[PDB]
UniProtKB/TrEMBL annotation:
Domain DHHA1 per the UniProt entry, residue ranges: 348-439
Keywords tagged on the record: Exonuclease, Hydrolase, Nuclease
Protein's recorded name: Single-stranded-DNA-specific exonuclease RecJ
Gene name of the encoded protein: recJ
Pfam families: DHH, DHHA1, RecJ_OB, ssDNA-exonuc_C
Segments forming domain RecJ OB: 452-556
GO biological process: DNA recombination; DNA repair
Similarity section: Belongs to the RecJ family.
MF terms (GO), sorted A to Z: 5'-3' exonuclease activity; nucleic acid binding
Residues of the Single-stranded-DNA-specific exonuclease RecJ C-terminal domain: 563-752
Entries under InterPro entries matching the protein: DDH_dom, DHH_sf, DHHA1_dom, RecJ, RecJ_C, RecJ_OB, SSDNA_exonuclease_RecJ
Origin superkingdom: Bacteria
Residues annotated as domain DDH: 81-224
Length: 756
């Protein structure tokens, strides 16, 4: 049986869209299912998402905005020399182009410099700032950098060179000493949308310096806003619909040349900006510097754009190869560590190119679902510089700050970070992170999760229904791309495609829906036999010879078969060791939790629960329901260890309880050792059941006891009619014995198939 890699959380929309609006707004079932799983139901929201009125807030409401506008205007008037300081991100290259063109249109002596990731690193560098002063630069406008360059800015500011900081990266407790700081998230000011990218901040500064901005600027903001992965809500959303509009209607010279090098000519949307255009502009600044990418974006002559688009695409080539090699070596090292049981993948080797290390780390976290540090051992500089990527259950900042004594310089956040340390401290640091992770392994679950937006049926996979979903685009952060679940799907056709037969081609269901699972062509032999499979994935339209067809890109795959096995008398024959980790053991309080697998009923196990063993008899059917209603398994093992039974002993009727109280009221104080047998006689009950009755009377505090001597509390609180917690426990215990221990497995299966 194929095992799911993730653990699937399907959103069950509590609210649904009116069947009137569904019709008033021509909402096909797929767009309707997506909207509802984002809970966007009211007419405003739906219109907001489908509408195109642009989102535009006075850029004058930005931090130090007017203060800045005039500082730039004056420099152009006094023939001052300008320098735009930028970054090698696609946001920084797109932001530089916008500002340089804006200043060129204002007739300014503008020049630009992008720091080298290796020779200079990110942000202001003393040498460059001094060099600019030496070149007569009087004003430096930074883009996607500066908010954390206090020292460098002050030095040059004291040299007489004003610095205007424009950034969107998290601000610190201290703001650098500079003429002006334009930041959407600045303490002293409040701007409607605070999730703008560097290009977005530049667009607003431009819209303020020049009233009407060239349309190229909108496309450039779109490229950077989708690459910096900023929130795709409010403003960012409109600029992308506009910038995606521009790239199709009036495609720029610079960008055209690029996609001609990739060989891409189909309609352009956010994924093109994500997977195709974005990653090419970064390649240059990850191997060589990105001035080329800026020069490509700045050029509108087909001849040079084409010559320059060649030099970029060459770098995209090499990044694929350099990443491919580093990963081959690192995937080999990671397999050993995880096989030895590491929980933090700290991989450190030599000749590892640093410009691609963050990339290599993302492939490692996706393949292993573990937080990873990827380091290059530079023995020519006795430093280990590298990158880190995280999982949600772990903050990369915290765990490094707790181990910061072994680290020389480390900066980043919860999901990612950059570090420089000593080659001799790596082996010491790995154990520390592993210790921190193996302690969190208790308080926290580390198994990968996937959020499922919609449960789609074969009757929704229509070309019309799938393109109408191209109406909710653009998709991205804060408006994530939908993930669909499809169950009870037959594996009609199965094939292994690719030179190395690594991709899997499949036909699904009775309607034979084409599906592809990349890098999983090794599962063909298992899916050859006709078998029903549940699937998670995205829906798109593949077009061949003018014929459009629905296609599903699978992300995860599970076998629909749910197996329930009777070991109700074969406990010692379980096919696994109690300490197997992959197996979850559902137990009840009477036993002490010895292993982490042992989780009590009702308690929320969050470890992947593909193989679940019901070791102890549930205290209640609903407690099992709770511990079952959270179950995603392929094989359930029902052992149900119990030491005694109550099925035949029975619960005394309520007429007998009063006939016990009768004896108690007659003497007030009684000793059960001498009076119990006579007591049990007139009650026509047994010794064990008398304890139960006295134990409910003591629970209801109707009586008190001391060394066998039972005493009456006279008038007690009228808590209930013998409806005590102890009385209830018995009711539930007899309930579980009748349905689970002393019933037929067939009907037990027909109940476990009722819950889940
Ligand atoms: Mg940025």
């Amino acid at each position: 049986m194929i095992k799911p890699k993730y653990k699937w959380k399907l959103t069950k929309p509590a609210e649904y869209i009116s069947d009137e609006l569904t019709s008033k707004l021509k909402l096909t079932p797929i767009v309707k299912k997506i909207l509802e799983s984002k809970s966007i139901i009211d007419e405003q929201a739906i219109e907001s998402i489908i509408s195109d009125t642009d989102i535009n807030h006075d850029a004058l409401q930005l931090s130090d905005m007017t203060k800045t506008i005039e500082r730039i205007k004056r420099a152009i008037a006094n023939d001052e020399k300008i320098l735009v300081y930028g970054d090698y991100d696609a946001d920084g290259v797109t932001a530089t182009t916008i500002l340089v063109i804006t200043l060129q249109l204002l007739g300014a002596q503008v020049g630009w410099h992008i720091p080298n990731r290796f020779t200079e690193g990110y942000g202001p560098n003393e040498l460059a700032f001094r060099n600019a002063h030496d070149e007569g630069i009087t004003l430096i406008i930074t883009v996607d950098n500066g908010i954390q360059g206090h020292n460098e800015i002050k030095m040059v500011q004291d040299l007489g060179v004003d610095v205007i900081v424009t950034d969107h990266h998290e601000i610190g407790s201290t703001l650098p000493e500079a003429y002006a700081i334009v930041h959407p998230m600045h303490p002293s000011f409040n701007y409607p949308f605070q999730q703008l990218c560097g290009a977005g901040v530049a667009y607003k500064l431009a819209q303020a310096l020049i009233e009407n901005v060239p349309d190229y600027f909108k496309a450039l903001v779109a490229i950077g806003t989708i690459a910096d992965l900023v929130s795709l809500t409010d403003e960012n959303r409109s600029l992308v619909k506009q910038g995606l509009k521009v790239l199709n209607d009036q495609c720029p010279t610079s960008v055209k040349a690029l996609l001609k090098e990739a060989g891409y000519n189909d309609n352009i949307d956010e994924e093109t900006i994500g997977f195709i255009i974005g990653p090419r502009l970064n390649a240059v600044g990850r191997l060589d510097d990105a001035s080329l990418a800026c020069e490509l974006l700045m050029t509108d002559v087909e001849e040079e754009a084409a010559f320059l688009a060649e030099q970029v695409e060459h770098f995209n080539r090499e990044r694929k190869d350099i990443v491919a090699t580093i990963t081959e070596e690192a995937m080999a090292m990671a397999e050993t560590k995880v096989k030895k049981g590491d929980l933090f993948l700290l991989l450190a080797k030599e000749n590892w190119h640093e410009g691609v290390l963050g990339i290599v780390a993302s492939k490692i976290v996706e393949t292993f679902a573990l937080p990873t540090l990827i380091l290059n051992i530079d023995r020519e500089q006795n430093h280990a510089k590298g990158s880190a990527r995280s999982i949600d259950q772990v903050s990369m900042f915290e765990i490094l700050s707790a181990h910061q004594e072994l680290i020389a310089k480390f900066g980043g956040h919860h999901m990612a970070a950059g570090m420089t340390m000593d080659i001799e401290n790596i082996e010491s640091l790995a154990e520390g992170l592993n210790k921190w992770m193996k302690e969190l392994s208790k308080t926290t679950s580390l198994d990968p999760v996937k959020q499922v937006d919609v449960l789609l049926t074969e009757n929704d996979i229509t070309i019309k229904n799938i393109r109408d979903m191209n109406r909710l685009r653009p998709f991205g952060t804060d408006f994530s791309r939908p993930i669909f679940e499809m169950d009870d799907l037959s594996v009609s056709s199965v094939k292994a495609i690719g030179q190395q037969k690594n991709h899997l081609k499949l036909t699904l269901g009775e309607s034979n829906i084409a599906a592809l699972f990349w890098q999983n062509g090794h599962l063909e032999p298992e899916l050859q036999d006709e078998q029903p499979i549940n699937i998670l994935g995205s829906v798109q339209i593949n077009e061949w010879n003018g014929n459009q067809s629905p296609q599903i890109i699978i992300q995860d795959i599970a076998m629909n078969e749910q197996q329930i096995l009777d070991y109700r008398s074969k406990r010692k024959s379980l096919p696994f060791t109690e300490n197997d980790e992959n197996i979850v053991v559902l137990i009840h309080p009477k036993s002490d939790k010895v292993n982490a697998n042992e989780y009590y009923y009702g308690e929320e196990i969050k470890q992947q629960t593909d193989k679940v063993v019901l070791r102890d008899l549930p205290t209640s059917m609903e407690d099992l329901s709770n511990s079952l209603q959270q179950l995603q398994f392929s094989q359930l093992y029902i052992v149900l260890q119990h030491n005694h039974s109550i099925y035949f002993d029975g619960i005394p009727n309520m007429d007998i309880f009063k006939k016990c109280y009768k004896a108690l009221i007659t003497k007030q104080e009684t000793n059960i050792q001498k009076e119990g047998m006579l007591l049990c006689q007139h009650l026509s009950v047994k010794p064990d059941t008398l304890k139960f009755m006295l134990k409910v009377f003591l629970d209801l505090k109707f009586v008190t006891q001391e060394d066998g001597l039972i005493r009456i509390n006279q008038q007690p609180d009228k808590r209930s009619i013998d409806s005590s917690k102890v009385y209830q426990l018995r009711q539930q215990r007899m309930d579980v014995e009748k349905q689970l221990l002393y019933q037929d497995f067939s009907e037990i299966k027909n109940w476990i198939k009722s819950q889940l």
